[PDB]
Amino acid sequence: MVKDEKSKTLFEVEGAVTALLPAAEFRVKLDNEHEIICHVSGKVRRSKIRIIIGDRVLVEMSIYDRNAKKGRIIRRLKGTSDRTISK
Known part of the structure; x- marks a missing residue:
């Protein structure tokens, strides 16, 4: 609803989690x-x-x-490995 029409202007960062907190925070x-x-x-x-x-x-x-302070973490997506790797 609020995260639907607006906030489409979004940047995507590729990184890795370092630690998690008891606040369901990654x-x-x-x-x-x-x-x-x-x-x-x-x-x-x-x-x-x-x-x-x-x-x-x-x-x-x-x-x-x-x-800005926090982002949407889901997981590592498929790293476009469909290029070849012996297909």
């Missing part, structure tokens, strides 16, 4: 040595995705304000 570290906050706020609720430490994550957040 804080990830960018390869540029930057730790950012992430929470579940997307299709993750409907699709039911399992976030685990040690795996890569896709951080979908907006640079403005609403999704």
Whole structure:
């Protein structure tokens, strides 16, 4: 509803979670040595995705304000491995 028509202006970061908090919070570290906050706020609720430490994550957040402090963490998407790898 609120995250539907607006906040489409969104930036996507590829990183990995560093630690989780008892607030269902997943804080990830960018390869540029930057730790950012992430929470579940997307299709993750409907699709039911399992976030685990040690795996890569896709951080979908907006640079403005609403999704500025925290991003939408789901999991590492398919890394376009359909190119060849012996097809």
